[PDB]
Amino acid sequence: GSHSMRYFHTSVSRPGRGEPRFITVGYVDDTLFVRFDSDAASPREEPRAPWIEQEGPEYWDRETQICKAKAQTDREDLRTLLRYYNQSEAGSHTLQNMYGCDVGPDGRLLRGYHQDAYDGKDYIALNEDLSSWTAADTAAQITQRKWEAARVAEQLRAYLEGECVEWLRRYLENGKETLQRADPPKTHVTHHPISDHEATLRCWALGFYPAEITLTWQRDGEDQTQDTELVETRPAGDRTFQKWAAVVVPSGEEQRYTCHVQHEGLPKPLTLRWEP
C-alpha cells in the first residue's frame, strides 16, 4: 500500500519558567520511530521502533545535531513572531512545524509537505507544487519574502523528492515485518435499548493498523452520514487503533441497518448487522 513519513515539532515558550520546551517526534505511517525532548534526562534523539535501532552512531549524532539546531531556531523564531504580531514578551506561545512525504505502492513521491503554525493557527505552508508558499497573513508574508529571496522552496523540494523518499523506502524495507503489515479490524455490533421505541446500534472496529478506516451505517442500503455519531479513531497502546460509529434507530427496525467497514487490511469491505 501507500506510506508516509512525518517529522513533527512543537516549541512552547513559558516566560519566567525558563526557556521554551521543544519536543519532536518522527513517524512512518502511524508508527512512532524517533523522539527528542529538550527536557529529557540526556536529550539525544532516541529510537522508538526496533527497525531504526540498526542505524549506526553517525545517524544518531546527525539526527541529534539537527534536533538541537531546530530547538535553537525555534527559540529565535518565537522571538521573531512576538515582533511580527506586536505581542508582549509576557505570554506563552506555541510554534509547530511538520514536514515529510507520502509515497505510493511503487515508492514514488505522491506529495511533499512543509508547514508551520503559530499559537495553533496556520502561519506559512509550502504548497503541493513544492515551489510556492501560502502565507496566512501579513506577518507570514514577511517570512515568505525572506524565503523567496533565499530559494528555500527549492532546498525543501530537493530534500522532499530525495532523502525523504529514499529514507522512507529504506525504513519500509528494514521494518517490513510491521510497517508493511496491515492488521484488519475485529468487528461487532452492540445493541443498547434507549426507550420503549428506540435503540442505539454501535458498530465497533478494534485491533486495526494503520489508523485510517471508514465505518458507515446504511439504512435500507442508504448511507446515514448525517445521522451517524462517529468517535475519533483512538490508539489502543499495542500499536493498534479503535473506532465506533453509532445510530439511534426505531425499535424493531434493527435488521434494516448495516454497518460497512473499509480498511486496508481487508481484501473486500465488510458488512455486518446486529446478530442478536
Binding site: R62, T80, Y99, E163, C164
Partner: peptide, 9 residues
Amino acid sequence: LRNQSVFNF
C-alpha cells in the same frame, strides 16, 4: 532521515 537545512522566519 531529518532535513539538515536551517531556516528562520
